[PDB]
C-alpha cells in the first residue's frame, strides 16, 4: 500500500524530469532496506541483476549524509561502488533525501535524463517537492 504511493511519486518524478530511470529506497534506522521501488527496468533484467540494492556507493553517501546530489557521471564519484552485473549503465544522476524534519527515511533518485544532458536546477527543486510528499507518507506508515 505504501509502496503503491511511493511508486506513484517515482513515476511522477521520472516523467517530469524526463529521466530514463527512477527509484526510491526507504530504510530503517540501521539503514536496512525496507522498501525499494523503481521504474524504467523490465522484469527480466531485474531477475538477471538478481539482488536488491543494499544502499551502498553513491546511494550510501545520500543515506549517510542526506543532501541533494547531482552528478554528470555517477560512476566518477569517489563514493561510487560500481554497478552489479546486468544492471543498466547509468551516467547522469539526481538524488534527494526522503525525509521529515526529525528524520531521514530514504532517497529518491533519477538517472540518464533523456535529452543526454545533466539534470537541471529546476529538476532538483521539482524532485525535492515530490520527495517531501513521500516523506509524509513514510512517516505516517
Q: By CB under 6 A, tell whether 55 contacts ligand HEM.
A: yes
From the list a copy of itself, ligand HEM, none, which binds 33 (C-beta under 5 to 8 Å, kind-based)?
A: none
Over 47-102, what HEC string results?
Answer: HHHCCCCCCCHHHHHHHHCCCCEEECCHHHCCCCCCCCCCCCCCCCEEEEEEECCC
| Burial class of 26 by CB neighbour count within 10 A (0 to 12, 13 to 18, 19+) | buried
Binding mask 122-141 for ligand HEM (x = CB under 6 A): --------------------
Does 77 belong to an annotated binding site? no
Smallest distance, Å, CB 79 to a copy of itself? 27
Is the Cβ–Cβ distance between 73 and 117 less than 8 Å? no
Draw the binding track, 86-115, toward ligand HEM (x: CB under 6 A; -: no contact): -x--x--x---------------x-x----
The CA distance from 82 to 76, in Å, is 9
The angle, 0 to 180 degrees and rounded to 10, between the axes of the packed helices 121-139 and 2-16 is 170
The count of residues interacting with ligand HEM (CB under 6 A) is 30
Binding site for a copy of itself (CB under 8 A): 1-2, 4-5, 8-9, 12, 15-16, 100-101, 122, 125-126, 128-130, 132-137, 139-141
The torsion angle over the Cα atoms of residues 132, 101, 35 and 18, rounded to 10 degrees, is 30
**Contact partner at residue 118 from ligand HEM, a copy of itself, none, CB < 5 to 8 Å by partner kind:** none
The option from ligand HEM, a copy of itself, none interacting with 24 (CB < 5 to 8 A, set by class) reads: none
Amino acid at each position: 500500500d505504501l509502496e503503491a504511493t511511493l511508486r506513484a511519486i517515482v513515476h511522477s518524478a521520472t516523467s517530469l524530469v524526463d529521466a530514463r530511470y527512477g527509484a526510491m529506497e526507504v530504510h530503517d534506522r540501521q539503514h536496512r532496506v525496507l522498501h525499494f521501488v523503481y521504474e524504467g527496468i523490465d522484469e527480466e533484467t531485474v531477475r538477471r541483476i538478481g539482488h536488491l540494492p543494499k544502499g551502498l556507493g553513491v546511494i550510501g553517501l545520500l543515506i549517510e549524509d542526506p543532501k541533494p546530489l547531482r552528478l554528470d557521471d555517477v560512476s566518477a564519484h569517489p563514493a561510487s561502488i560500481g554497478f552489479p552485473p546486468y544492471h543498466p549503465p547509468m551516467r547522469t544522476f539526481l538524488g534527494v533525501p526522503v525525509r521529515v524534519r526529525d528524520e531521514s527515511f530514504g532517497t529518491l533518485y533519477l538517472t540518464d535524463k533523456t535529452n543526454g544532458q545533466p539534470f537541471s536546477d529546476d529538476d532538483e527543486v521539482l524532485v525535492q517537492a515530490l520527495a517531501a510528499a513521500a516523506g509524509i507518507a513514510v512517516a505516517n506508515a
